[PDB]
Amino acid sequence: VAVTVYEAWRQLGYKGSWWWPRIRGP
Amino acid sequence: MRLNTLSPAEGSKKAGKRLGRGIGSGLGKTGGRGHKGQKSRSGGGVRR
Amino acid sequence: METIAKHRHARSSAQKVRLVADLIRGKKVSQALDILTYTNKKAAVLVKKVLESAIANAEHNDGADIDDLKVTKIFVDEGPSMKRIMPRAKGRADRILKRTSHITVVVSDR
Amino acid sequence: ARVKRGVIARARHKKILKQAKGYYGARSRVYRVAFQAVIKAGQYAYRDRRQRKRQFRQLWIARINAAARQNGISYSKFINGLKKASVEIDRKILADIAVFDKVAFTALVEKAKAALA
Amino acid sequence: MYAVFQSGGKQHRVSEGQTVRLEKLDIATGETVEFAEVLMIANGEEVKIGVPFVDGGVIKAEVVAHGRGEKVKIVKFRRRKHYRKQQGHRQWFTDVKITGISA
RNA sequence: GUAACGGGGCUAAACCAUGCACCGAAGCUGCGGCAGCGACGCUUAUGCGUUGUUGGGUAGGGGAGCGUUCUGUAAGCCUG
RNA sequence: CCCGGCGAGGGGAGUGAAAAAGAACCUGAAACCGUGUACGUACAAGCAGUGGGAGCACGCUUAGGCGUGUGACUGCGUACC
Numbered sequence: 001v002a003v004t005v006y007e008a009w010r011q012l013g014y015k016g017s018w019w020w021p022r023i024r025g026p
Numbered sequence: 027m028r029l030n031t032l033s034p035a036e037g038s039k040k041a042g043k044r045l046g047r048g049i050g051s052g053l054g055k056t057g058g059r060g061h062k063g064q065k066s067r068s069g070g071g072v073r074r
Numbered sequence: 075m076e077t078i079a080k081h082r083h084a085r086s087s088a089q090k091v092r093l094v095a096d097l098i099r100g101k102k103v104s105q106a107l108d109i110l111t112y113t114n115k116k117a118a119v120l121v122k123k124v125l126e127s128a129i130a131n132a133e134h135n136d137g138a139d140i141d142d143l144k145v146t147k148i149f150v151d152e153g154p155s156m157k158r159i160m161p162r163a164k165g166r167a168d169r170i171l172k173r174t175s176h177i178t179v180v181v182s183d184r
Numbered sequence: 185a186r187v188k189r190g191v192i193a194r195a196r197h198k199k200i201l202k203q204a205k206g207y208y209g210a211r212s213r214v215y216r217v218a219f220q221a222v223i224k225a226g227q228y229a230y231r232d233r234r235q236r237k238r239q240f241r242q243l244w245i246a247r248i249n250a251a252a253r254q255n256g257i258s259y260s261k262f263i264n265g266l267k268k269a270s271v272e273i274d275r276k277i278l279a280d281i282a283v284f285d286k287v288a289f290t291a292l293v294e295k296a297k298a299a300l301a
Numbered sequence: 302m303y304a305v306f307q308s309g310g311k312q313h314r315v316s317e318g319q320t321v322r323l324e325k326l327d328i329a330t331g332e333t334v335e336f337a338e339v340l341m342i343a344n345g346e347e348v349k350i351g352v353p354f355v356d357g358g359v360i361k362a363e364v365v366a367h368g369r370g371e372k373v374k375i376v377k378f379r380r381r382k383h384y385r386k387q388q389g390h391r392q393w394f395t396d397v398k399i400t401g402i403s404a
Numbered sequence: 405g406u407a408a409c410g411g412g413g414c415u416a417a418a419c420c421a422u423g424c425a426c427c428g429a430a431g432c433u434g435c436g437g438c439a440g441c442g443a444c445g446c447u448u449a450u451g452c453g454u455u456g457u458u459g460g461g462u463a464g465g466g467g468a469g470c471g472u473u474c475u476g477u478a479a480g481c482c483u484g
Numbered sequence: 485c486c487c488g489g490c491g492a493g494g495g496g497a498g499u500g501a502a503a504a505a506g507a508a509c510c511u512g513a514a515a516c517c518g519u520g521u522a523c524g525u526a527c528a529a530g531c532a533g534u535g536g537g538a539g540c541a542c543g544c545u546u547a548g549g550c551g552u553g554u555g556a557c558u559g560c561g562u563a564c565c
Contacts, residue, residue: 003508006157011165030477052464055383060463081493083508088517123488130487131495149519154508178519187473194513206554208532214515220564221533223385226376228534228561233373234430236535239559243536245427260426272353273340274312277305288347295351310435324436381565382462393436 075184076146077132081124081177083153088175091117091150103129103143103181120177128179139183147180244279251282255293262293265300302344304402306336306360315399320365325393333363334397342404361401369393 045057059066084091094117098106103125110122129140153174160168197215204211204218211221249259266273271292282289303316309324328334339358341349348355375388 004156007159009159009167011167014165028477049383049385056463058464077495079487079494083493092518124494127487127494134486135496147519152517185474189472192472197514211532216564220531223376223378224531224563225533226374226387227378229374230376231430232535232560235560238429239535242427242559258426264425269351270353271351273305277312277314280314285343288341288343288349291347291349295349299351308435379461380563384462390437 075132075136075182077128077136077181079124079128079131079179081120084120084175084177085172086117086120086175087173088150088152091120091175091177094118094121095148095150098125098145099148101145103140103145106145121179124177124179125181128181132181132183137183142183143181144183145179146182147178149178151176151178241275244275247279248275248282251289252293255290257293257297261300262296265296266292269295269299271295302342302402304342304358304360305340306338307340308336312340315360315402317399317402319399321362321397321399323395323397325367326364326395328364328395330364330366333361333400336360336362342402348404357404359403360399361403362397362399365396365398367393367395 043053043057044051045053046055048054056066064070064072094110094113094115097113098109098121101109106125107122110118110125125145129143132143133140153176155174156172158170158172160170162168200215200222201212201218204222206212207218207221211217245259248262252259252262273292278289278292281292303314305312305314307313313321313323315321326334337359338354339360340353340355341347342355342358343349348358350356369391370393371391373390375390377384377386379385
């Protein structure tokens, strides 16, 4: 019978953005 | 006259400094360079 | 005399099995069996099988007379965990654990 | 040439954690917290070695005052009379007498009152 | 019967057949020790003095053993000033056994 | 939320004047122990005595040490 | 040989110097998670300790009293870099 194996993957680190207005903008 | 009975002259084998090895040694945390500045950086200094 | 039966690498979390173990700690085997018979839980089946195995061991190998046996000890440990992957939204990934457990039962005429 | 830090570090950590027995929670299980706990305990011990003497002297004085007022005189006048009579017994012994001997203390009060008057 | 005397800058209250711990004394282990001064003697009636040091009272005792006390730890520390220090200590003492209190 | 004596409470437990007591610190004194620097003796050299005095500490300067792994002393010594 | 689904897992027997060397196999620490015994805890307010301190349990001891564990109540006390 077969033995168990694990794998893994990492993301690309997608460039998310804060789409709401700035905290203390101009 | 035995290989384990010789000894050097007194006051001839000073140890040498070792920087950054705790509080008790008196040279930990910046080992004598003071605080921030140009002279405390790696490779820092000025010309002759 | 002490008789021991164990079930290692049981497919269940230890916390869920521990809820059933304390139901029978210290009872006589005769009432422990039918206590376990009428609880609607998955772990009850496993604990019942272990208990029956312990009774059979205590009858065959060593002396007889299961009419005066008691559950002296019972406890649940943690076995190794298997690790898997579950995808989430926006390209993220998460880690899943599948926990196991070890089940031990000790019976004694005394 | 190459030195491994395996054994010395374990010895140091065990030594620190041994003297943190009986502390609550993670303060007796985790090295980073136990180290601070032990240091603070050391400082407290150093300070209380001084506070102990003050606490005991204050207790002795409070205990002498009650017996003195029982015999009909206040603490200040009592020890002023004792000083005028040139009696050198200290406060610890005086409190001990006041508890365990009601007659010798009365005799001392008599002497102090006689000298003061 | 009990008496009061001072030995090492401190005062004590003892009775016959009792052991006491004092400061270190430069006295051999076997032989006895004298205490000329006595501040008070009490048994039924109190031979207590106005002027210190009751006139004809002495206390008889002999040395039992020398030794050192238990260890204590001294710790000095200063918040976020990069300074700390440690030190240990043990204190010598002497044990005597009271043998006779004479009025 | 009392909220402009720390409270309780106070017609003296408030204020002015005089006086005598006592409490009160890691300050001073008493007892025991450690170390640094001088002066004077002996060893007349290491050293051993008599004393006087000093010992909070960051940046930083000076002086003494503990422990770890390798080489000699090692065909030695310890160890079923 | 026995329980179990002609399972997985165990309990005996046997080999071996050793199976707590059983193939997930030399030794086998820490974080982390449990079972058992002693003491404390349901009118009590805060960096969780430190100084004082009853009571209880266990061991020794010729009383005397010590040693270990716990710790009611109480003075002081706002982590580290």
